[PDB]
Short mmCIF file of C-alpha atoms in Angstrom, two decimals:
data_model
loop_
_atom_site.label_atom_id
_atom_site.label_comp_id
_atom_site.label_asym_id
_atom_site.label_seq_id
_atom_site.Cartn_x
_atom_site.Cartn_y
_atom_site.Cartn_z
CA UNK Y 406 84.33 171.78 127.36
CA UNK Y 407 86.48 174.87 126.84
CA UNK Y 408 89.19 172.95 124.96
CA UNK Y 409 86.58 171.30 122.72
CA UNK Y 410 84.97 174.65 121.94
CA UNK Y 411 88.42 176.08 121.19
CA UNK Y 412 89.25 173.23 118.81
CA UNK Y 413 85.82 173.71 117.21
CA UNK Y 414 83.19 176.21 118.33
CA UNK Y 415 80.58 174.23 116.37
CA UNK Y 416 78.27 172.37 118.75
CA UNK Y 417 75.06 170.32 118.81
CA UNK Y 418 72.04 170.67 121.08
CA UNK Y 419 72.33 168.25 123.99
CA UNK Y 420 69.69 166.84 126.27
CA UNK Y 421 69.12 163.99 123.81
CA UNK Y 422 68.21 166.20 120.85
CA UNK Y 423 71.13 164.99 118.72
CA UNK Y 424 70.56 161.28 119.35
CA UNK Y 425 66.88 161.48 118.39
CA UNK Y 426 67.59 163.39 115.17
CA UNK Y 427 70.35 161.01 114.08
CA UNK Y 428 68.05 158.03 114.70
CA UNK Y 429 65.67 159.36 112.05
CA UNK Y 430 68.46 159.80 109.50
CA UNK Y 431 69.89 156.35 110.24
CA UNK Y 432 66.43 154.80 109.90
CA UNK Y 433 65.71 156.40 106.52
CA UNK Y 434 69.17 155.58 105.13
CA UNK Y 435 68.71 151.94 106.16
CA UNK Y 436 66.18 151.56 103.34
CA UNK Y 437 68.96 152.32 100.82
CA UNK Y 438 71.29 149.47 101.94
CA UNK Y 439 70.08 146.22 100.29
CA UNK Y 440 72.19 143.85 102.38
CA UNK Y 441 72.25 142.13 105.76
CA UNK Y 442 73.75 145.30 107.28
CA UNK Y 443 70.24 146.82 107.06
CA UNK Y 444 69.09 145.14 110.28
CA UNK Y 445 72.18 146.52 112.02
CA UNK Y 446 71.41 150.06 110.85
CA UNK Y 447 67.91 149.86 112.34
CA UNK Y 448 69.53 148.48 115.49
CA UNK Y 449 71.80 151.54 115.49
CA UNK Y 450 68.72 153.77 115.50
CA UNK Y 451 67.14 152.03 118.50
CA UNK Y 452 70.49 152.03 120.30
CA UNK Y 453 70.82 155.79 119.85
CA UNK Y 454 67.48 156.26 121.64
CA UNK Y 455 68.78 154.62 124.84
CA UNK Y 456 70.73 157.74 125.90
CA UNK Y 457 67.68 160.07 125.88
CA UNK Y 458 65.39 157.24 127.03
CA UNK Y 459 67.76 156.80 129.99
CA UNK Y 460 67.68 160.50 130.92
CA UNK Y 461 63.88 160.54 131.24
CA UNK Y 462 64.05 157.35 133.31
CA UNK Y 463 66.58 158.83 135.74
CA UNK Y 464 64.36 161.90 136.19
CA UNK Y 465 61.20 159.90 136.95
CA UNK Y 466 59.12 160.08 133.76
CA UNK Y 467 57.69 157.57 131.32
CA UNK Y 468 60.65 156.81 128.99
CA UNK Y 469 58.89 155.68 125.81
CA UNK Y 470 56.15 158.32 125.95
CA UNK Y 471 58.74 161.07 126.43
CA UNK Y 472 60.93 159.50 123.73
CA UNK Q 386 22.22 125.47 90.46
CA UNK Q 387 23.99 122.10 90.73
CA UNK Q 388 27.34 121.11 89.21
CA UNK Q 389 27.47 117.52 87.94
CA UNK Q 390 30.97 116.15 87.29
CA UNK Q 394 38.45 107.26 91.27
CA UNK Q 395 36.53 108.04 94.45
CA UNK Q 396 39.47 110.17 95.60
CA UNK Q 397 39.80 112.00 92.28
CA UNK Q 398 36.19 113.20 92.51
CA UNK Q 399 36.65 114.31 96.13
CA UNK Q 400 39.54 116.61 95.24
CA UNK Q 401 37.43 117.85 92.32
CA UNK Q 402 34.78 118.95 94.82
CA UNK Q 403 37.51 120.67 96.84
CA UNK Q 404 38.78 122.12 93.56
CA UNK Q 405 35.32 123.56 92.87
CA UNK Q 406 34.83 124.76 96.46
CA UNK Q 407 38.21 126.50 96.64
CA UNK Q 408 37.49 128.14 93.29
CA UNK Q 409 34.12 129.33 94.60
CA UNK Q 410 35.89 130.69 97.69
CA UNK Q 411 38.39 132.58 95.54
CA UNK Q 412 35.59 133.67 93.20
CA UNK Q 413 33.64 134.79 96.27
CA UNK Q 414 36.67 136.83 97.38
CA UNK Q 415 36.78 138.76 94.10
CA UNK Q 416 33.05 139.45 94.45
CA UNK Q 417 33.15 141.06 97.90
CA UNK Q 418 36.54 142.65 97.10
CA UNK Q 419 36.82 143.55 93.40
CA UNK Q 420 40.61 143.69 93.51
CA UNK Q 421 43.71 141.49 93.53
CA UNK Q 422 47.11 141.70 95.22
CA UNK Q 423 50.46 140.07 94.59
CA UNK Q 424 51.55 136.95 96.45
CA UNK Q 425 54.82 135.54 97.68
CA UNK Q 426 55.05 137.94 100.62
CA UNK Q 427 54.69 141.06 98.47
CA UNK Q 428 52.10 142.89 100.63
CA UNK Q 429 53.77 141.73 103.85
CA UNK Q 430 56.90 143.70 102.91
CA UNK Q 431 54.99 146.80 101.80
CA UNK Q 432 52.88 146.48 104.94
CA UNK Q 433 56.08 146.21 106.99
CA UNK Q 434 57.76 149.06 105.10
CA UNK Q 435 55.02 151.70 105.04
CA UNK Q 436 53.82 151.06 108.61
CA UNK Q 437 57.35 151.80 109.83
CA UNK Q 438 57.05 155.21 108.14
CA UNK Q 439 53.80 155.97 109.98
CA UNK Q 440 55.36 154.96 113.31
CA UNK Q 441 57.92 157.76 112.91
CA UNK Q 442 55.13 160.35 112.62
CA UNK Q 443 53.07 159.10 115.57
CA UNK Q 444 53.83 159.80 119.23
CA UNK Q 445 53.46 158.00 122.53
CA UNK Q 446 53.56 154.23 122.86
CA UNK Q 447 52.03 153.73 119.39
CA UNK Q 448 55.40 153.99 117.62
CA UNK Q 449 56.94 151.05 119.48
CA UNK Q 450 53.71 149.05 119.14
CA UNK Q 451 52.99 149.83 115.48
CA UNK Q 452 56.64 149.14 114.62
CA UNK Q 453 56.35 145.67 116.16
CA UNK Q 454 53.24 145.15 114.03
CA UNK Q 455 55.34 146.01 110.97
CA UNK Q 456 58.33 143.82 111.87
CA UNK Q 457 55.96 140.91 112.56
CA UNK Q 458 54.79 140.85 108.93
CA UNK Q 459 58.34 140.01 107.79
CA UNK Q 460 57.99 136.45 109.14
CA UNK Q 461 55.75 135.43 106.21
CA UNK Q 462 58.28 136.17 103.41
#
């Protein structure tokens, strides 16, 4: 954590905030790829949600509603 | 009003006139037309996925499945 901040002080908000924001960008950009890789890009969005959806599950909350 | 017009060729003609009346009845109740060949099913699948991003709760996962289901027709 210290070595990473020394190599680059730039950081992203944790607690699942980064994964949920990237999933929106990946979903919108999937519309611009007219090819069979489009279904994989949407799958990348849903796969990104599993990290934050797993945190709420381990804490004892409704995953999808909190997601 | 009555419409006077092989035994099989006349039967399909009655179906041809009934199906036309059904389509003509559709334009009456709904004065509009839409493209075929899976055109609305893609727009319905595309724009509903946009709404699911704005909603919250379980509706996003449910409305998204409603959108992906329309893609089976085309």
